């Protein structure tokens, strides 16, 4: 029953805490927590490849893609491993994150421990935007806050 946690920080006011739980090996992962300081609405939410914070969130590299697929939404088969879709901030700017995903893992080749969770400035178009960038990042915009994913239990 592996457990992980991530403290999202950035230059601006967006900040949060996101926990992860995987009861069985290679089974679904629960992702739950809270982000704040966001504009109301949808915000891209991804696991990026590197747990490098030397030059801010930019050092995290691209979306975690150990299978070298194209960007999509979490429900699509063609997707990055770290494509977690969008989180929703209310009028107050608080996104209550509740997600269940079977592509990310806390072990094996799809392990995200030691990589970087990142919340984005705008919505992820899930790869349906009809342009090249949509097949890469989903046009979610700049990185508002991020953090290395660490072992919790």
């Amino acid at each position, epitope marked *: 029953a592996t457990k992980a946690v991530c403290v999202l920080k950035g230059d601006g006011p967006v900040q949060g805490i996101i926990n992860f739980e995987q009861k069985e090996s290679n089974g679904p992962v629960k992702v739950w927590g809270s982000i704040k300081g966001l504009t109301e609405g949808l915000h891209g939410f991804h696991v990026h490849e590197f747990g490098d914070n030397t030059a801010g969130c930019t050092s995290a590299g691209p979306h975690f893609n150990p299978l070298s697929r194209k960007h999509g939404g979490p429900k699509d088969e063609e997707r990055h491993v770290g494509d977690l879709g969008n989180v929703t901030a209310d009028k107050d700017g608080v996104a209550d994150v509740s997600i269940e995903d079977s592509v990310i893992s806390l072990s094996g080749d799809h392990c995200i421990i030691g990589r970087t969770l990142v919340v984005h400035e705008k919505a992820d*178009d899930l790869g349906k935007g009809g342009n090249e960038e949509s097949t890469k990042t989903g046009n979610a915009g700049s990185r508002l806050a991020c953090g290395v994913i660490g072992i919790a239990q």
Partner: nanobody, 115 residues
């Protein structure tokens, strides 16, 4: 829930401004797109607007540089300004959310380009 208007017949090179009134619950996700749909085909996403403030727009390749998407937060409305229209643009246009579960489609508005 979603109500589009502003379409019609326009000669090649002309222009149009589609409008859509969306419910406040759908608008408040601040991820709105215009899709175009040809007969028998699936609706493709054509323009997106998301983020705070006045919003930020992104465009699919066949319309980039000719179409602009915008929104009015107070009126909960979305707009597609289409310029330099071509026959390939002929389609029924719909406005919906994106980046999440699609809401029930509206009636859309037909756009025909021909001289």
């Amino acid at each position: 829930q979603l109500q589009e208007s502003g379409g019609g017949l326009v000669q090649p090179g002309g222009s149009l401004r589609l409008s859509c009134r969306a419910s406040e619950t759908l608008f408040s996700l601040y991820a709105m797109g215009w899709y175009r749909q040809a007969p028998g085909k699936q609706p493709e996403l054509i323009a997106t607007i998301s983020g705070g403030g006045e919003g930020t727009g992104n465009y699919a390749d066949p319309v980039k540089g000719r179409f602009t998407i915008s929104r009015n937060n107070a009126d909960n409305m979305v707009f597609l300004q289409m310029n330099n229209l071509k026959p390939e643009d002929t389609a029924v246009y719909y406005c919906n959310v994106y980046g999440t579960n699609l809401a029930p489609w509206g009636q859309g508005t037909q756009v025909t380009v021909s001289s």
